[PDB]
Design a protein around this ligand. Structure first.
Ligand SMILES: OC[C@H]1O[C@@H](O[C@H]2[C@H](O)[C@@H](O)[C@H](O)O[C@@H]2CO)[C@H](O)[C@@H](O)[C@H]1O
Ligand SMILES: OC[C@H]1O[C@@H](O[C@H]2[C@H](O)[C@@H](O)[C@H](O)O[C@@H]2CO)[C@H](O)[C@@H](O)[C@H]1O
Length: 131
């Protein structure tokens, strides 16, 4: 029922990816080279009926409880787990000044992601790309 999308970095054209296709909670979200087709499941995302981002793989939310972002089951009363599309950024629903951010602008595949104060830099710039 939902249409899925990639979250693609303007820093290097790599996409957000649940490391190793791991459906367990606490799996790191990293940058990785884009896959197409049935194996792309851990790079595909959608927004739920309230507009909040989830993974196609396990319907988990993005979680910024730790320095590095990871997957966790969605909890509507945990502000660290509600992330939204906001123009060319992924923003924290509860604080729009906080966006997803490729740590230290690392351009290598496998880079980790953090929640950071918005500054307009290319490491905070993401394009939503329909599957
Ligand atoms: O390492 C990030 C990368 O992992 C891929 O999954 C690999 C896994 O890393 C490897 O240990 C196993 O032998 O094969 C899997 C499939 O190639 C993910 O597919 C990819 O999306 C990234 O998350
Ligand atoms: O650490 C997250 C934060 O890093 C900034 O980049 C810094 C980096 O932390 C530092 O080690 C290096 O010497 O200087 C970099 C450039 O100022 C990012 O700008 C910010 O977006 C976050 O990613």
């Amino acid at each position: 029922k939902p249409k899925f999308f990639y979250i693609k970095s303007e820093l290097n054209g790599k996409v957000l990816d649940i490391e190793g296709q791991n459906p367990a909670p606490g799996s790191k979200i990293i940058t990785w080279d884009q896959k197409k087709g049935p194996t792309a499941v851990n790079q595909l995302w959608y927004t739920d009926q309230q507009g909040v981002i989830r993974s196609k793989l396990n319907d988990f939310a993005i979680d910024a409880s730790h320095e590095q972002i990871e997957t966790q089951p969605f909890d509507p009363n945990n502000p660290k787990r509600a992330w939204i599309v906001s123009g060319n950024t992924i923003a924290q629903l509860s604080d729009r000044d906080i966006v997803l951010d490729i740590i230290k602008s690392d351009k290598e595949a496998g880079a980790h992601i953090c929640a950071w104060k918005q500054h307009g830099g290319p490491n905070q710039k993401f394009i939503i790309e329909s599957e």
